[PDB]
Amino acid sequence: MKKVFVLGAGTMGAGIVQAFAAKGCEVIVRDIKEEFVDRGIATITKSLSKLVAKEKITEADKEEILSRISGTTDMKLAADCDLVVEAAIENMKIKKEIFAELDGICKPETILASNTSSLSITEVASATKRADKVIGMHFFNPAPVMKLVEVIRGAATSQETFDAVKEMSESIGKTPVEVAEAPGFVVNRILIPMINEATFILQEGVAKEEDIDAAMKLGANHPMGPLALGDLIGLDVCLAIMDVLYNETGDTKYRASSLLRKYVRAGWLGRKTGKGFYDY
Template sequence: MQKIFVVGAGTMGSGIAQVFAENGFDVIIRDVDIKFVERGLGVIENNLKKSVEKGKITEEEKNKVLGRIKGTVDINEAKDVDFVIEAAIENMEIKKQIFKELDNVCKEGTILATNTSSLSITEIASSTARPEKVIGMHFF
């Protein structure tokens, strides 16, 4: 597993993208509007800048992490990823639509994860043709 696709560039999505990138994964972070993507990327850059200032990482490490993250508004960029984690708004219909789109775009073996804290993972998975590849994993 090397390529990660994060749906949602808000607080949770940007944090998840940062953790994956810090651990050597290539990450694409996607949201519905470029301004949300840019804001999420800015949050990640700010977090890493603070880590440099505190001596936790070097400037070079910060740049390597940032180099592993790409922003997009195009869900079709998920076509070659190994793992997707969705961190969109807690709305069942929106999540089901996202998973339906991901199911159509992603390669057969891609694992689709949701970051939901309260919605039925089984119901979200029912919007795909691969419910056995849909998991829940909540970051907090």
């Protein structure tokens, strides 16, 4: 499967683009205006530049990768792609609209995949007449590094789709895991509450920020502390996910801390805004 369409050119969409193009695939990134399309590819390039500098690739490796890539704002550009990964915007109404368009545009065998963290593959599937070829294919930031992809079956998802996406994953050297659609899949369901837990510990006067992070690095060999990890992932992302977990399950187990919610309202979202649980 040579040809892969990716909707969305932000941190995640672009990373995913780099991931496919770097293992042979041709990729078209699509967004709402050229400003964004361009900015992302820009960032891909910067990414490969840093890889050449670190002797992880050759200038030609790179120069080639970039040629397998092109931008656009027309969905219509997806008519010959074999895979679609939507990594646009975590809103159900729009995703339904988007998948209904691609149902129309794309060659009937084209599998349609979502990079959603929270929303229902099934419900998106339902907006098309190919529910059986609608799947979630969920990468992790930074997408060219992290080897995992959750392959999430919605209720109608076929075996054959599942297998194709599994093989496609193996072929860009990711490791796929089967998930039956359910709130937060596997990673987010564990990882974010962990971070939310910490915010409660913080809020409850139990321990200061640096002690909490140190406690998990050095007490549990974690690669980083949940607070810094959150500043990395983005507290808004984190709050959103806790909210979906809460809303999807009706289980108060997943309630966000008032603290987390206050930081996100402050706009202290972490790294990307120079400030969250820590300062930068």
